[PDB]
Design a protein around this ligand. Structure first.
Ligand SMILES: COc1ccc(CC[C@@H](OC(=O)[C@@H]2CCCCN2C(=O)[C@H](c2cc(OC)c(OC)c(OC)c2)C2CCCCC2)c2cccc(OCC(=O)O)c2)cc1OC
Length: 128
């Protein structure tokens, strides 16, 4: 499925080049600018456990998910991955646990050593 396609075709966007965060651009965005640390970022997303069975989406609440980029407000893979997106871009991320919840997990929601998959649409971003 989509996770396997990211393994096969995804770009390694980690600094260590350990393939811990792999990305496919599914829809190209506009212009050249990508968000800076501190920017208010607005996204729609769907996230799941790649193996396990748990599913989460901002469409559930039918409102965008908002966070400040690069402040450790979200898992490391998002700070890394969303920084590489343009406005209007949709991307797939496959995320190994080292860039998510690691060995601790976040039980009951997230098991230990879990791989996560997300589809993320970057709606907009703004300086404060
Ligand atoms: C720096 O590390 C962390 C920082 C924050 C967290 C909490 C989960 C953090 O979620 C995440 O970082 C990732 C990426 C963003 C969308 C949500 N997300 C999740 O994993 C989802 C998620 C969604 C949640 O509710 C919306 C969670 O409840 C807080 C949650 O808790 C562990 C996890 C998963 C749900 C199961 C299926 C796979 C996805 C979170 C959730 C809701 C709002 C958040 O920030 C907005 C703000 O604070 O205004 C941050 C975990 C962190 O690492 C373990």
């Amino acid at each position: 499925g989509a996770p396997a396609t990211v393994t096969e075709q995804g770009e390694d966007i980690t600094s260590k080049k350990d393939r811990g965060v792999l990305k496919i651009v599914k829809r190209v965005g506009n212009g050249e600018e990508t968000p800076l640390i501190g920017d208010k970022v607005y996204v729609h997303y769907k996230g799941k456990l790649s193996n396990g069975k748990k599913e989460d989406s901002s469409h559930d609440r039918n409102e965008p998910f908002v966070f400040s980029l690069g402040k450790g407000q979200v898992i490391k893979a998002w700070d890394i991955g969303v920084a590489t997106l343009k406005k209007g871009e949709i991307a797939h991320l496959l995320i190994k646990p080292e860039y998510a919840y690691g060995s601790a997990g976040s039980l009951p929601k997230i098991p230990s050593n879990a791989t996560l998959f997300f589809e993320i649409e970057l709606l907009d971003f703004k300086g404060e």
